[PDB]
Write an enzyme that holds these catalytic residues in place. Structure first.
Site, PDB file in Angstrom:
ATOM      1  N   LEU A 185       0.831  -1.194   0.000  1.00 46.49           N
ATOM      2  CA  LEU A 185       0.000   0.000   0.000  1.00 46.49           C
ATOM      3  C   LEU A 185       0.871   1.252   0.000  1.00 46.49           C
ATOM      4  O   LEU A 185       1.992   1.253   0.515  1.00 46.49           O
ATOM      5  CB  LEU A 185      -0.935   0.009   1.211  1.00 46.49           C
ATOM      6  CG  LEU A 185      -2.429   0.029   0.878  1.00 46.49           C
ATOM      7  CD1 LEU A 185      -3.268  -0.196   2.121  1.00 46.49           C
ATOM      8  CD2 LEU A 185      -2.807   1.336   0.212  1.00 46.49           C
ATOM      9  N   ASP A 186       0.340   2.322  -0.588  1.00 47.10           N
ATOM     10  CA  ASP A 186       1.098   3.559  -0.719  1.00 47.10           C
ATOM     11  C   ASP A 186       1.390   4.160   0.652  1.00 47.10           C
ATOM     12  O   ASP A 186       0.605   4.032   1.594  1.00 47.10           O
ATOM     13  CB  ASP A 186       0.327   4.566  -1.574  1.00 47.10           C
ATOM     14  CG  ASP A 186       1.189   5.730  -2.024  1.00 47.10           C
ATOM     15  OD1 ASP A 186       2.422   5.664  -1.843  1.00 47.10           O
ATOM     16  OD2 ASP A 186       0.631   6.713  -2.557  1.00 47.10           O
ATOM     17  N   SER A 187       2.546   4.820   0.759  1.00 45.54           N
ATOM     18  CA  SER A 187       2.922   5.439   2.025  1.00 45.54           C
ATOM     19  C   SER A 187       1.943   6.541   2.413  1.00 45.54           C
ATOM     20  O   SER A 187       1.543   6.641   3.578  1.00 45.54           O
ATOM     21  CB  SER A 187       4.345   5.993   1.940  1.00 45.54           C
ATOM     22  OG  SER A 187       4.420   7.076   1.034  1.00 45.54           O
ATOM     23  N   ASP A 223      -1.065   6.640   1.837  1.00 45.06           N
ATOM     24  CA  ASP A 223      -2.267   6.003   2.359  1.00 45.06           C
ATOM     25  C   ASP A 223      -2.142   5.723   3.849  1.00 45.06           C
ATOM     26  O   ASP A 223      -3.158   5.634   4.547  1.00 45.06           O
ATOM     27  CB  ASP A 223      -2.557   4.714   1.592  1.00 45.06           C
ATOM     28  CG  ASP A 223      -2.921   4.968   0.141  1.00 45.06           C
ATOM     29  OD1 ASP A 223      -3.480   6.048  -0.151  1.00 45.06           O
ATOM     30  OD2 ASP A 223      -2.649   4.093  -0.707  1.00 45.06           O
TER      31      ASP A 223
END
Ligand SMILES: CCCCCCCCCCCCCCCCCC(=O)OC[C@H](COP(=O)([O-])OCC(O)COP(=O)([O-])OC[C@@H](COC(=O)CCCCCCCCCCCCCCCCC)OC(=O)CCCCCCCCCCCCCCCCC)OC(=O)CCCCCCCCCCCCCCCCC
Ligand SMILES: CCCCCCCCCCCCCCCCCC(=O)OC[C@H](COP(=O)(O)OCCN)OC(=O)CCCCCCCCCCCCCCCCC
Ligand SMILES: CCCCCCCCCCCCCCCCCC(=O)OC[C@H](COP(=O)(O)OCCN)OC(=O)CCCCCCCCCCCCCCCCC
Ligand SMILES: CCCCCCCCCCCCCCCCCC(=O)OC[C@H](COP(=O)(O)OCCN)OC(=O)CCCCCCCCCCCCCCCCC
Ligand SMILES: C[C@H](CCC(=O)O)[C@H]1CC[C@H]2[C@@H]3[C@H](O)C[C@@H]4C[C@H](O)CC[C@]4(C)[C@H]3C[C@H](O)[C@]12C
Ligand SMILES: *C(=O)CCCCCCCCCCCCC
Lengths: 127, 221, 171, 128, 110, 81, 62, 122, 88, 71
Positions: free
Chosen positions: I42-44, I46
């Site tokens: 998952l994106d940072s 996020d």
């Protein structure tokens, strides 16, 4: 960029002790071990006389609580205050100075019996 | 007269009973908040009796029961003026305080020091009633600062909170600046009219009043 | 110090709180949260390391002009209405050592369990000092944080006050 | 462009809007790191005594002692009479006393004339 | 003023306790039916503060504007009072709208 | 106790104001991932609420009914004796 | 940085920045949480004036 | 205050000064002026303890109303007619003093025309 | 305060009940151990939105210096557990 | 404290009510309107006006005792 392996272990190790400590912060059913307490007979009568709900008799119970409060905290002080005011405060000049009652036209005085003639005829009108 | 005067003072004396019994004369910690509330309840009923008499026949009297200090030609007594302003405000203040204390029993139910919170709330009410019924300026000043000092303690109730201490000391600072004007008024009335009693202040009715009234306005500010 | 990665995360973190303070209504917050969210992705793929800093400074400066004068604060943070509200009810643990025996006898079970911890800490103290000195540079430590417990039985060095601190809602 | 923030002694410059945090030179990283080094050496020394179980008292703080010693007892031996202290001392020490003398002297001289001549009202004044 | 100002603070305190010591109105709302009795008093008192006719406050507040308007007064001071009275309604409507109407903003578990 | 959370498969953004956001962001090519996280503030008891004018008129239907009878009730014993 | 040697008794005491104590990381684990200091840290000459109950120098929106 | 726009943004000589209300000559001007009589001469007013500002000319009405309140207690809803009578009596006094405002204002307007004539005669 | 005490398992239900309405994660793949960079990537950024959702859920707010160190649905319960003195 | 109906704090949902809250709350809301309407009817002068304001423009120079302009 989370915890390094050491940090994860240390936090886990701390939490293991922490939650053990917080569990120690609980009182056993026998705590506190209060010293023996004397119970007055007047208290005993109410605990035994109330026991079950019996909401009908609570009005008698509350009247007892209010009557006691209305006696020691209202009736006794007003005896002390009145005795103080009637026989000590009022025996000296100008301790209690009233405002002389208002005198309206056409009134009689209880003390002297004078009568103040009414006012002049009013040239009034309806509305 | 006897009933009016007797019932006027009983209201004030009643409020001090919870304070006096707070000196370990009857130890019931779990019931003290209810004990204080019920005292306020009866104080309302007692005050209504002199309040009604004023409504009926406009009765009004002063009560100088105690002689405290006579500084040469200035005589200081513990006087009480039961008149229009006091008769109406006493029932109103007690009626409102009655509801606040009953509300505060639930609101402050989880506080370890709830008993100490109700004593402070009752101390303020005693100071305010002294302020309202004061007949001479010195007695009014006792209540004037008394409300000021209870506000300091109640504002800083949660004393581990630096922002509560800052707000507590801030109240004393501003009200202290106002107290400069109050003392200015007291010095003027004594210097010029030779009294602090409101009866003598009004009877002489001075013409020039810019300074003494300017001081009071700063006190009210 | 804060890494350039961390700064963007903080700048994004706050910009939504102040932005949330302008919208109040949830639905109007979602509409603009996505828009502000998008403006980050517009330059996110950039990898210059010299123009990203310029945008960040322009980003920080832009944030200041529009920042809410009165941002919402959760009522337990540095600025909330209940920050340190219960600091007066928090009392150290050594205060119990000064109790009178009569009032200590009110809790026979509680204090027996306390004596074990004092024994536990007293026994563990010597090992914790030995662990710290050996696992630390010759010239002295370089950062915060202490080693975890390596062998079984040994407890994390310098644990007493972290473990036995007062509760957050003492009463 | 938005107006630039102007700092002051009572309003410091925000760290974000400061052209000194973003630059990463060779000196800054080895300087901001050094501050954390000594800062950690002190914390280690404090932590040893704080957590020690065989201790009951006050941890002497040399920084605190130096703070109070420089505020009370070290001021005079580091004082030189020069053009600044003499002028600052003169108008703060002698200034107000002179200013309040002419205020009260003028006020009371003015009052005395009005009382001798009877032009000041003291009808009910029998307290002083 | 004693009756309804004190009532307003108590009703405000009732909302505070339920929402877990939350005072910001930007995290409240949707309480018109959740706490009907607190809402009733809040609207009752808020109307009294604004000076609804034939309600405690009317017999004191309105009788003052009448005397202020028709007195040998200061025009700017007379104007400032009237502007203030309108401002009384604006922040009262601020409390009702953000604390009773709309949809809730408070956390999930309350 | 063992408090039970409601089943999570009931938070529909459609039929509530949150959807209108989805249309707006769809125009520029974006979506609100937390839309269903906020969907609990519009469905159920919270759905709809009185208006500001409606809130003020709370309990007005009964008062008017009591008022009309009040004046009428007084009128009966007003011009009769 | 020593204070200027103007002969006002400062001597060789550090001249720390004129920053209030409210302008410090509130979350960093302080040895003195209320004062926001660290044991062994040189205290500001005016530390007793910059405590949280007194003069604050935090940046302002305006 | 509509008239204020005239006195502050118009002519000051025509408008009368509230603190300098007519110093004009005595009753002369209105033939057979009738003196305003009083009912509560000296002692009736100084027996009900009326306020120094209330007992102007409706004291007989105010004194009568206060009589009802004392007896009507606790029927505080009573005496409504008595209060209405005093309100009306006060209202007539309010207009009577209000008439003097317009009476002098036109007298001021009349008084300037004669002066204008003399200045414009030559 | 009358606020019900938070149980160790009760927190976990709330934590996952929030992650399950993200509309960016697979409900059947997210578990007590699901890293946001190494497990499902998952994106940072996020993480910032994930933590903000947590803070808006429990009331209290996590510091940014320690929010950046938490991408493990199990760790959030651990962090909240060590912040409201929950032991059972 | 008090009686303690002990309504469980429900998760995302509308909070539970009781029969006493709404009936009493609605009782006073109707009381306010009943009191507002009843007083408005009997004495509406206090809120609109007591006596008509006598316009001085619609008066005559005779009742005011203005001497004639012709002296
Ligand atoms: C002889 C007295 C023997 C003392 C016996 C004490 C006792 O047995 O009860 C223990 C009693 C109960 O114990 P506790 O529950 O553990 O509370 C003690 C804690 O420390 C917590 O104490 P606290 O925080 O509640 O503060 C106690 C103190 C201070 O509390 C305050 O109220 C703060 C000050 C605000 C006062 C402002 C009001 C305006 C006063 C002027 C109006 C007149 O309260 C008082 O002074 C009495 C209330 C004022 C009357 O504690 C105390 O009362 C404190 C110790 C006694 C101090 C006595 C000081 C007053 C004595 C006055 C006697 C001379 C008359 C003076 C008249 C002139 C007045 C200016
Ligand atoms: C500017 C003013 C400001 C004042 C500030 C003062 C602050 C101090 C705190 C307020 C204290 C007020 C309470 C005082 C109560 C009265 C005490 C008292 O009764 O004193 C004796 C008094 C006679 O005194 P008096 O003749 O007026 O002159 C004395 C001059 N020192 O009266 C008597 O003769 C005694 C009569 C007693 C009758 C009652 C007996 C039964 C009592 C039973 C109690 C149980
Ligand atoms: C109406 C009331 C409006 C307030 C007006 C008072 C404003 C006072 C003021 O602005 O002085 C602040 C003064 C400015 O100096 P400063 O720039 O902050 O310090 C050097 C850094 N360049 O900084 C200071 O505090 C120095 C003392 C100023 C004395 C005035
Ligand atoms: C009033 C007198 C004002 C004098 C101001 C001018 C003094 C001056 O310029 O020289 C003072 C002298 C320093 O010599 P200078 O030529 O200035 O150059 C530096 C060389 N050291 O410095 C000296 O060593 C001479 C001593 C200076 C004068 C000392 C006395 C006055 C100043 C101290 C004020 C004392 C305050 C007392 C407070 C009491 C009330 C509370
Ligand atoms: C009357 C009141 C509340 C109960 C009720 O509603 O009647 C009860 C609650 C606690 C009681 C008080 C406390 O018990 C402390 C005192 C105890 C003694 O009975 C003397 C009166 C005393 C001062 C009580 C007066 C009164 O009966 C109280 C105040
Ligand atoms: C004269 O004394 C009027 C004093 C009232 C001041 C308020 C005037 C407000 C005017 C607004 C325009 C309304 C016109 C009907």
């Amino acid at each position: 960029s989370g915890y390094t392996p050491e940090e994860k272990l240390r936090l886990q190790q701390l939490r293991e002790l922490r939650r053990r400590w917080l569990k120690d912060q609980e009182l056993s059913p026998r705590e506190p071990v209060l010293p023996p307490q004397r119970v007055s007979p007047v208290e005993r009568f109410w605990n035994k006389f109330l026991q079950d709900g019996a909401l009908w008799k609570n009005v008698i119970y509350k009247t007892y609580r209010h009557s006691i409060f209305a006696f020691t905290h209202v009736l006794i002080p007003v005896w002390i205050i009145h005795y103080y005011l009637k026989y000590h405060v009022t025996t000296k000049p100008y301790t209690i100075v009233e405002k002389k009652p208002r005198i309206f036209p056409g009134d009689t005085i209880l003390e002297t019996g004078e009568v103040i003639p009414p006012m002049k005829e009013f040239p009034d009108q309806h509305h | 007269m006897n009933m009016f005067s007797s019932l006027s003072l009983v209201t004030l004396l009643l409020l001090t009973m919870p304070i006096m019994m707070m000196s370990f004369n009857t130890y019931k910690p779990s019931n003290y908040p209810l004990y204080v509330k019920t005292a306020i309840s009866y104080a309302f009923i007692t005050s209504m009796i002199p309040t009604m008499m004023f409504i009926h026949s406009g009765q009004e009297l002063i009560i100088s029961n105690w002689h405290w200090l006579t500084i040469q030609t200035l005589k200081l007594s513990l006087s009480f003026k039961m008149d229009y302003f006091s008769m109406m405000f006493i029932p109103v203040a007690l009626f409102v305080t009655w509801s606040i204390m009953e509300f505060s029993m639930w609101y402050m139910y989880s506080d370890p020091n709830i008993n100490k919170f109700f004593k402070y709330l009752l101390l303020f009410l005693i100071t305010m009633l002294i302020l309202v019924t004061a007949n001479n300026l010195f007695q009014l000043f006792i209540g004037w600062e008394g409300v000021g000092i209870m506000s300091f303690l109640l504002i800083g109730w949660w004393y581990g909170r630096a922002d509560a201490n800052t707000a507590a000391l801030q109240a004393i600072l501003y009200n202290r600046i106002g107290d400069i004007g109050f003392i200015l008024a007291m010095a003027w009335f004594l210097t010029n009219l030779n009294t602090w009693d409101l009866q003598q202040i009004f009877m002489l009715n001075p013409s020039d009043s810019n300074m003494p009234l300017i001081g009071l306005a700063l006190a009210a500010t | 110090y804060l890494t350039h990665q961390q700064k963007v995360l903080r700048l994004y973190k706050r910009a939504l709180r102040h932005l949330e303070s302008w919208c109040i209504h949830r639905d109007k917050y979602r509409y603009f949260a996505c828009l502000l969210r998008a403006r980050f992705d517009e330059h996110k793929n950039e990898k210059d390391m010299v123009k990203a800093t310029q945008l960040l400074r322009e980003a920080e400066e832009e944030f200041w002009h529009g920042q809410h004068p009165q941002p919402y604060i959760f009522p337990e943070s540095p600025g909330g209405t209940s920050y340190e509200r219960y600091e007066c009810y928090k009392v150290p643990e050594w205060c119990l050592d000064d109790w009178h025996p009569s009032e200590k006898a009110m809790y026979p079970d509680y204090f027996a369990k306390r004596e074990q911890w004092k024994k536990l800490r007293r026994e563990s103290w010597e090992r914790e000092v030995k662990q710290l000195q050996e696992e630390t540079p010759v010239g002295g430590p370089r950062t915060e944080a202490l080693p975890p417990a390596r062998k079984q039985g040994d407890l994390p060095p310098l644990w007493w006050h972290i473990v036995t601190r007062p509760r957050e809602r003492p009463m | 462009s938005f107006p630039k923030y102007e700092a002051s002694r009572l309003s410091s410059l925000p760290t974000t809007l400061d052209p000194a945090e973003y630059d990463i030179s060779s000196e800054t990283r080895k300087a901001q790191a050094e501050r954390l080094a000594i800062r950690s050496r002190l914390k280690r020394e404090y932590q040893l005594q704080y957590y020690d179980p065989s201790r009951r008292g006050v941890i002497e703080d040399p920084a605190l002692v130096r703070w109070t010693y420089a505020r009370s007892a070290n001021i005079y031996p580091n004082f030189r009479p020069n053009t600044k202290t003499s002028l600052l001392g003169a108008l703060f020490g002698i200034g107000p006393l002179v200013f309040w003398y002419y205020v009260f002297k003028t006020d009371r001289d003015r009052k005395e004339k009005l009382i001798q001549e009877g032009k000041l009202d003291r009808t009910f004044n029998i307290s002083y | 003023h004693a009756f309804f100002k004190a009532m307003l603070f108590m009703c405000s305190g009732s909302i505070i306790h339920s929402l877990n010591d939350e005072q910001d109105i930007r995290k409240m709302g949707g309480l018109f039916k959740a706490m009907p009795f607190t809402t009733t008093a809040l609207i009752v008192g808020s109307l009294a503060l604004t000076g609804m006719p034939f309600l405690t406050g009317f017999y004191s507040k309105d009788l003052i504007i009448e005397a202020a308007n028709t007195s040998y007064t200061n025009a700017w001071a007379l104007l400032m009072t009237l502007i203030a009275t309108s401002f009384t309604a604006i922040y009262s409507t601020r409390i009702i709208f953000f604390a009773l109407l709309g949809q809730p903003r408070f956390p999930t578990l309350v | 106790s063992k408090m039970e959370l409601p089943d999570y498969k009931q938070w529909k953004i459609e039929g509530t104001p949150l959807e209108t956001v989805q249309e707006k962001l769809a125009a520029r090519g974006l979506r609100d991932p937390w839309g269903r996280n906020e969907a609990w503030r519009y469905m159920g008891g919270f759905a709809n609420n009185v208006s500001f004018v409606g809130a003020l008129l709370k309990g007005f239907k009964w008062g008017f009914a009591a008022f009309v009878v009040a004046i009428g009730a007084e009128y009966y014993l007003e011009s009769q004796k | 940085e020593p204070y200027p040697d103007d002969g006002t008794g400062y001597g060789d005491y550090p001249k720390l920045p004129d920053r209030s104590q409210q302008e410090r990381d509130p979350w960093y684990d302080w040895d003195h949480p209320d004062l926001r200091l660290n044991w062994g840290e040189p205290m500001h000459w005016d530390l007793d004036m910059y405590i949280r109950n007194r003069v604050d120098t935090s940046p302002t929106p305006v | 205050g509509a008239h204020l726009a005239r006195r502050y943004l118009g002519d000051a000589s025509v408008e009368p000064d509230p603190l300098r209300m007519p110093t004009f000559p005595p009753d002369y001007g209105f033939p057979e002026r009738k003196e305003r009589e009083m009912v509560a001469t000296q002692q009736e007013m100084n027996d009900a303890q009326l306020v120094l500002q209330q007992r102007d000319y409706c004291a007989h009405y105010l004194i009568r109303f206060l009589k009802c309140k004392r007896d009507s207690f606790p029927n505080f809803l009573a005496c409504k007619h008595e209060r209405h009578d005093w309100d009306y009596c006060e209202h007539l006094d309010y207009v009577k003093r209000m008439k003097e405002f317009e009476r002098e204002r036109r007298l001021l307007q009349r008084k300037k025309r004669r002066e204008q004539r003399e200045a414009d005669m030559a | 305060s009358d606020a019900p005490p938070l149980t160790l398992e009760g927190i976990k239900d709330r934590v996952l009940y929030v992650l399950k309405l993200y509309d960016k994660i697979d409900p059947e793949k997210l578990s007590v151990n699901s890293h946001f960079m190494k497990d499902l990537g998952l994106d940072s950024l996020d993480q910032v939105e994930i933590i903000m959702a947590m803070e808006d859920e429990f009331g209290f707010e996590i510091p940014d210096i320690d929010a950046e160190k938490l991408m493990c649905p199990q760790e959030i319960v651990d962090y909240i557990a060590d912040k409201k003195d929950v032991y059972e | 404290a008090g009686g303690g109906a002990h309504i469980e704090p429900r998760y995302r949902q509308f909070p539970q009510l009781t029969r006493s809250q709404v009936i009493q709350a609605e009782f006073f809301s109707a009381t306010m309107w009943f009191w507002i309407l009843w007083r408005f009817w009997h004495d509406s002068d206090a809120v609109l006006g007591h006596f008509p304001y006598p316009d001085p423009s619609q008066w005559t120079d005779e009742e005011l005792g203005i001497p004639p302009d012709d002296e």
